[PDB]
Design a protein around this ligand. Structure first.
Ligand code: CU1
Length: 105
């Protein structure tokens, strides 16, 4: 695939790695809707609000299957490490008007 998953389960915001590249989620939006990172970088999303959110990449984007991330509760986090250059669109499964992309350069 074009991403690896450090933790299949969400984890606490306080447990996010020191060097972390963070996208906050609040007010029903991804706070950085267009993020540029390098090959090999790990992106971490953190839900800052009570409404559960996830990130969802449809089939063919990060790999052959869809990657439907777990639902993050308030102050939970989820990471993906990107291993190939490209542009990767994602949305929130229950709220598909929430859209973002990671541009890996
Ligand atoms: Cu959401």
């Amino acid at each position: 695939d074009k991403a690896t998953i450090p933790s299949e389960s969400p984890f606490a915001a306080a447990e996010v790695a020191d060097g972390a590249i963070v996208v906050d989620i609040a007010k029903m939006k991804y706070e950085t809707p267009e993020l540029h990172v390098k090959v090999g970088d790990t992106v971490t999303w953190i839900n800052r609000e009570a409404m559960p959110h996830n990130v969802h990449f449809v089939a063919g984007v990060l790999g052959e299957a869809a990657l439907k991330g777990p639902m993050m509760k308030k102050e939970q986090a989820y990471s993906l490490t990107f291993t190939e250059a490209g542009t990767y669109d994602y949305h929130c499964t229950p709220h598909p008007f929430m859209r973002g992309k990671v541009v890996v350069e």
